[PDB]
Amino acid sequence: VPNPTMPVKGAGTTLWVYKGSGDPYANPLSDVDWSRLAKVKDLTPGELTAESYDDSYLDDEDADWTATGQGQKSAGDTSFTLAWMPGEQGQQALLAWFNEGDTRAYKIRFPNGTVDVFRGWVSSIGKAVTAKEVITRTVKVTNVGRPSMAEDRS
Amino acid sequence: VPNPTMPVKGAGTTLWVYKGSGDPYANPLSDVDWSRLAKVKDLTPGELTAESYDDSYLDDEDADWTATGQGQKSAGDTSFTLAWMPGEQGQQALLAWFNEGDTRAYKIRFPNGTVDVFRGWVSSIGKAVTAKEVITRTVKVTNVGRPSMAEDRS
Amino acid sequence: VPNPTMPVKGAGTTLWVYKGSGDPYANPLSDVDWSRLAKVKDLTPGELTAESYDDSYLDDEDADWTATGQGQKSAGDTSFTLAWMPGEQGQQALLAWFNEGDTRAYKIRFPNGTVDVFRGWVSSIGKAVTAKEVITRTVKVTNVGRPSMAEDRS
Amino acid sequence: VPNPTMPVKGAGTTLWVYKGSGDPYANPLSDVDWSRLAKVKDLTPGELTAESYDDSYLDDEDADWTATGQGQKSAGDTSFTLAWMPGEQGQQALLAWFNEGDTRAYKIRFPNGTVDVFRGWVSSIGKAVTAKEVITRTVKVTNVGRPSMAEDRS
Amino acid sequence: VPNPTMPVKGAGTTLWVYKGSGDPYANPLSDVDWSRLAKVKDLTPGELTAESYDDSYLDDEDADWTATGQGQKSAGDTSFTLAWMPGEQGQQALLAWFNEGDTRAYKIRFPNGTVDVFRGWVSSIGKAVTAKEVITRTVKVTNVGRPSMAEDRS
Amino acid sequence: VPNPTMPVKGAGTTLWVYKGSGDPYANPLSDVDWSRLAKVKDLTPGELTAESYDDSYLDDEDADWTATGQGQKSAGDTSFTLAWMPGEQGQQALLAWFNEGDTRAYKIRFPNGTVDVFRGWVSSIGKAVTAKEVITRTVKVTNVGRPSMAEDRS
Amino acid sequence: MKHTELRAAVLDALEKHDTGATFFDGRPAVFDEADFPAVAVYLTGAEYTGEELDSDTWQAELHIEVFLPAQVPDSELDAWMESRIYPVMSDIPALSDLITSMVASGYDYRRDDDAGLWSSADLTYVITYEM
Amino acid sequence: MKHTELRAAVLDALEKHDTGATFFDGRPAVFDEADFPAVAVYLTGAEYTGEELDSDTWQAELHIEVFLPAQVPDSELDAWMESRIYPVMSDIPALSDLITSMVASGYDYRRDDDAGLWSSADLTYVITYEM
Amino acid sequence: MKHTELRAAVLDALEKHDTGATFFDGRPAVFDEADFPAVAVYLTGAEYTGEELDSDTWQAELHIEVFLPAQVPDSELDAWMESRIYPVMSDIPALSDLITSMVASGYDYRRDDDAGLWSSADLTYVITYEM
Amino acid sequence: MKHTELRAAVLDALEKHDTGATFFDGRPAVFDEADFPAVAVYLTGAEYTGEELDSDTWQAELHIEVFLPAQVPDSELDAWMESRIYPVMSDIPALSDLITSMVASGYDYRRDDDAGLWSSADLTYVITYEM
Amino acid sequence: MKHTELRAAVLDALEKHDTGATFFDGRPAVFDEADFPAVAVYLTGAEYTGEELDSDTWQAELHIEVFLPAQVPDSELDAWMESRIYPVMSDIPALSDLITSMVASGYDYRRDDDAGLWSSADLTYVITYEM
Amino acid sequence: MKHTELRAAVLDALEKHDTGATFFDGRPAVFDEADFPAVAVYLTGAEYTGEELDSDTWQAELHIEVFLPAQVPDSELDAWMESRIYPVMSDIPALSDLITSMVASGYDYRRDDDAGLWSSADLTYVITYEM
Secondary structure (H helix, E strand, C coil), X not given: CCCCCXXXXXXXXXXXXXXXXXXXXXXXXXXXXXXXXXCEEEEECXXXXXXXXXXXXXXCCCCCECCEEEEEEECCEEEEEEEXXXXXXXXXXXXXXXXXXXXXXXXXXXXXXXXXXXXXXXXXXXXXXXXXXXXXXXXXXXXXXXXECHHHCC | CCCCCCCCECCCCEEEEECCCXXXXXXXXXXXXXXXXXCEEEEECCCEECCEEECCCCCCCCCCECCXXXXXXXXXXXXXXXXXXXXXXXXXXXXXXXXXXXXXXXXXXXXXXXXXXXXXXXXXXXXXXXXXXXXXXXXXXXXCCCXXXXXXXX | CCCCCCCCECCCCEEEEXXXXXXXXXXXXXXXXXXXXXXXXXXXXXXXXXXXXXXXCCCCCCCCECCEEECCEECCEEEEEEECCCCCHHHHHHHHHHHCCCCEEEEEEXXXXXXXEEEEEEEEEXXXXXXXXXXXXXXXXXXXXXXXXXXXXX | CCCCCCCXXXXXXXXXXXXXXXXXXXXXXXXXXXXXXXXXXXXXXXXXXXXXXXXXXXXXXXXXXXXXXXXXXXXXXEXXXXXXXXXXXXXXXXHHHHHCCXXXXXXXXXXXXXXXXXXXXXXXXXXXXXXXXXXXXEEEEEECCCCECHXXXX | CCCCCCCCECCCCEEEEECCCCCCCCCCCCCCCEEEECCEEEEECCCEECCEEECCCCCXXXXXXXXXXXXXXXXXXXXXXXXXXXXXXXXXXXXXXXXXXXXXXXXXXXXXXXXEEEEEEEEEEEEECCCCCECEEEEEEEECCCCECHHHCC | CCCCCCCCXXXXXXXXEECCCCCCCXXXXXXXXXXXXXXXXXXXXXXXXXXXXXXCCCCCCCCCECCEEEEEEECXXXXXXXXXXXXXXXXXXXXXXXXXXXXXXXXXXXCCCCEEEEEEEEEEEEEECCCCCECXXXXXXXXXXXXXXXXXXX | CCHHHHHHHHHHHHHCCCCCCXXXXXXXXXXXXXXXXXXXXXXXXXXXXXXXXXXXXXXXXXXXXXXXXXXXXXXXXXXXXXXXXXXXXXXXXXXXHHEEEEEEEEEEEEECCCCCCCEEEEEEEEEEECC | CCHXXXXXXXXXXXXXXXXXXXXXXXXXXXXXXXXXXXXXXXXEEEEECCCCCCCCCEEEEEEEEEEECCCCCHHHHHHHHHHHHHHHHHCCCCCCCCEXXXXXEEEEEEECCCCCCCEEEEEEEEEEECC | CCHHHHHHHHHHHHHCCCCCCCEEECCCCCCCCCCCCCEEEEEEEEEECCCCCCCCCEEEEEEEEEEECCCCCHHHHHHHHXXXXXXXXXXXXXXXXXXXXXXXXXXXXXXXXXXXXXXXXEEEEEEEECC | CCHHHHHHHHHHHHHCCCCCCCCCECCCCCCCCCCCCCXXXXXXXXXXXXXXXXXXXXXXXXXXXXXXXXXXXXXXXXXXXXXXXXXXXXXXXXXXXXXXXXXXXXXXXXXXXXXXXXXXXXXXXXXXXXX | CCHHHHHHHHHHHHXXXXXXXXXXXXXXXXXXXXXXXXXXXXXXXXXXXXXXXXXCCEEEEEEEEEEECCXXXXXXXXXXXXXXXXXXXXXXXXXXXXXXXXXXXXXXXXXXXXCCCCEEEEEEEEEEECC | CCXXXXXXXXXXXXHCCCCCCCEEECCCCCCCCCCCCCEEEEEEEEEECCCCCCCCCEEEEEEEEEEECCCCCHHHHHHHHHHHHHHHHHCXXXXXXXXXXXXXXXXXXXXXXXXXXXEEEEEEEEEEECC
């Protein structure tokens, strides 16, 4: 039984791409109108970050210690790799996403029962060929806007 | 029995976040009005530093050896990683701290019996997913202003 | 039996170079009028990428989170190494390709049954000599224009 | 028995900090009016260096080979780590040294019988915490002015 | 028996330096008027390369994908190390080549039966000394002009 | 018996510093008026080098391949480490060499029977302290002018 | 935590399904041919992980091993490991309270040729808990 | 998935070619001089790979071992290992459904010097599947 | 410091709780079926750490081993190891004077099958002191 | 390719020079005092390299082993190993068709002290071919 | 340099302190129960380190082993190593001439269970000298 | 090159100094208590270095080993290695023509306790030559 208040294991995580019309943030728990990607061999979600803003004047009395405040936040870049399958609809959809410029929505569903949602455009598409291994497809997506985190919903 | 004179081991260190109204430096030994972060897997406290100020005039007799004095000190950045528990109040508090710009006070309580207090804002929120491992939340905090060290109190 | 849907194993990939007259994208499945490179020891196909276009105006309501759009895509660089055979037609063709600047077409045929087509000019030709190992020829190709992926055809 | 004319084994080195009034270089062999730091876990003394002064004109007969002369020498930075003892006098003295910017004198006493003296201000104070290890305090000192080497006295 | 159209292993490669008067490219298979360097411990022939030339006008219809053509080719740098034998005429010739600025022709003779000829000047002369190893002389040559490859002859 | 023709082993190399009046290059085989350093634990003689000079005009017919000629040569930097013996005259001489700006001459005598001579000023002086090892002194010398190589004499 | 509780929980969740086999708790397991289907559960090789600063963490390996007579076809042994033991051990509500993380490890077969009286097959797990 | 299915799928397509050899399914195999050229197939050393996030992955090593009388010439064993087994084992149409990846590993020879009753030679494969 | 006082301190702090067991100080320990629940304490594998420049540091492993009759149930050893030895061993006021650092390490069970007369289980610690 | 013709080629090129010794093709070789020199040739330890994408590659070690009576002087074994076997094995026109790469490896001596009936010395090669 | 000088220099200053024990110089040492407290010094495992270019350097391990009757309590052995041998071995004026560097290594205990006649414990050192 | 020449050169340069000891060339060496010192020289473990592109290079270990009766004091063996075998091997004019590089390695002692008839000590060298 999934429990948001206890640690889980990463196994079982699935990746989804929104296709259709509507608001992706409205019902992230929905599974209708959501394409799915099969057998992701690795998945590293993007790292949220922000840059420092200097808060210092000439009139300030104390200047021994620096003082900075949060500046402009930005969602990171999400990169995952998955088995190369030119026949499936999901990967043809991925290359359609890359070839024509667009910012779509993708979603991550942990075994914990919470759901993480992002919006962005894809930036890189690569392969990996080896004599005795499965051909893999490597994808990197650059996020835009404000992500809807997993625990915004309680 | 805690003993400041003798060396200790790092096992048993706990981290706290100040919530409420008052002066965080007034009673760092206080444990009331202090939220706690549970299940921390790593903790590297920030490293203090300073810049070099050049003290050299052309009127000086000797210039064979450089002469520099301390410049502007600055508290470092504190980073810790902890198990992903989206149901707990502490991590929802962390993400609330991140999305809206603010600077608060966090505290480190060693088993030695001394207490370390900083002030800063959060700069990064990351996550790590693995097939056979617990999902971990990685946090980085950029300190602001002047810290209150452990042995400022005697 | 080749099947695009199922995962494939990397063994069996072959590389071809277009020579002659026609349109390289007209029939990638064709094997006539296509030279072949024999016994490559490694093959890393290029990694498609794109650069960010900043989408920011001072009139916007919120500037907390960055917003960018896809910029100028570009095919990557393809690098492969193969056994040094100075007397063969294919490698003399490679050196003619390098010395006389041209943007020809090369093709990768996976065992999966799909075919990948690129266009570019060669940027590096190198060699590796060892006391107890086969002399090898290392090649790097810089792609140009818009490539023809294997999944455009269905 | 210590002997400066023979190789020595590094074990047994102790470090001292001058406190009080007088001239630090007057008697480096003195042990009165010198505080001591307890059980340093590592100690890497600074590396003296200098920069090149270009000695070139257009009137010189030959310019095939470069010609440079010594420029501005400078003492290095001394870094040592030692066990965290927040209650002891020496480490409170270290933090007083860092917070109120001053340039003092520190000394290294080798088992060989020679004594090394430096002068500088502290540039970094750091800490390291581990699950099953002793909490350590890491210090970096930036030297200033002219050092007094061990073999200046014979 | 040497055969160009088969893989070969690099054992038996010999390096030669042209001394005398004539055209080095006239008969690279010749061994008369060609000094020889003995006891070479490593040999990495130079890597050919080229620069990218941007071919983009604002009048073009499409600018989604970058378009670049070959720029300026250049032979690489060839480096080899060989045992320190100050008595041999070859190494005295090498140091004469270095001290007195000049560009000459050097040649590589593979066991395969083909011959590779370059032209360039020397850029580095190093040495390596070890307690239990043979003193080695390390040389680096910067090619100049156009090389004459192995399979330019058929 | 030393033989310049045959390769030698690195063991037995000794390092010398010239003191007195005369020409160091006159009799490098001399051992009178030459101080000696004792127990060098490592010795890496500096590598000679030169920088490229562009040789290209607008009137040149061929511009596909780059053309460069040798520029300004320069001797390298020689670095050695040796056991710390503050009582010996040689190391007091080294520190006298560093403290006051000067360019002296140092010489390397291989077991092969040849002698290598350099001229330069010292740039770095450091130590290395370890609980279970000999205190070592690290020296780095920056060469000037034209070195007299071991193969200039035959 | 207390190894008694963990083994008790595993055996409780493993007994509910019909197997008709004697179940042994702990290393000492003495049996003749009459009670041949025999399943023994034990913990081995505990260590101090030292993973988290907050509280203690330990690592131990959980073993489920079944005994079947020699010369039984390998196919039959395959069945116990892949049809009976694997589905029950994936989800057990009782374990989730005590164990922070459970990870599978490969099962393996061994036969006795000195005397030819038994042929076992154990399934290995890795347990991370708090003591 | 079920090791029974995989061994059956291998043996079915290994039997259609005429070899005139007794085939043993599974590890236990007992014979004598009369029925001697005997080919046994078994799976050993299963392990949890944990390669992909989506679902389970396991690695097991597939074995095809052939037993021939001692003092048989070596060249005869070469033929059994290359000509008969290696071509058939490359492409099994019924295999591709169950196995995601099958990688060859070298075969090796061993003889019995204790008593001189048997000489075997097994081909080893690496199987990656889903359970 | 000297190993004698360290073992004396640990045995003193371990005897206060009632256990009704015979405690052996040092490596040699000879007994029979009468005084079976014996507990022996010894130090082994001392080494020169060479950690700090100031003064000498050494590492040694501290063992606490308890002997129980063969065929005693496993769960009994579990309790003896955890419930009795672990709580007392965590905090001992006398130790902190001598030992600069004390780290736990896993306990392990060993049984005897050659003759079936004993079955022990020793908890291991790592000690860093100054000599 | 097939191991048979490779050993055939080596033995053919090795027999032309007069040596006056029996040659054994393949691993099994049974001999007595009269047939003392012996000179057996065999292949061992084949593996799948997977170096090139185009086609299959394998590695195997080629052994040439010579038997001489016990208590024969060491220098004789040397003279035999180098002078006879090394020059012929360097260049063989027949091998170059089959073997893509042949690399030497050191020879080694071994004597029998259990009974003192034989002393051998084998030269080892590494072969990279295509199957 | 000359191992005889080094062992003599150790034993001379190891003998001045009153111990009343037979001292053996070199590896061969034969005794019985009468003259039992016996301390033997030997050098083992010499090796060419080649640390410096100027002159030859070697590493050897110095051993000081003491033999005590079997079933002696561990307390007595601790005493010889920590009270009698460690303080004397730290500073020897004679060794200062011959030894460039001498680093301690941990001592260890061992007992004889085959026959129960002896129990020894050797302190180990690492010696770096010039030859 | 030819191992015969190298061993011959070493033995020639080693015999000129008076030693009064039987010298054995090559590994086979049989003797009894009369002709005891019995210095034996042999080469072992030849291998293909593959260091230089120009020509072949090999690595082999040169052994000089002396046999002395058991229970002979350690210091006397020390003498043979330090005062006899070592000084002669530093500079030998004959070797310099054949060997490109000769590097020392530590000598080591060994005694026979199965029967107590011999006690040897070999000095190891590393040889890099051309073949």
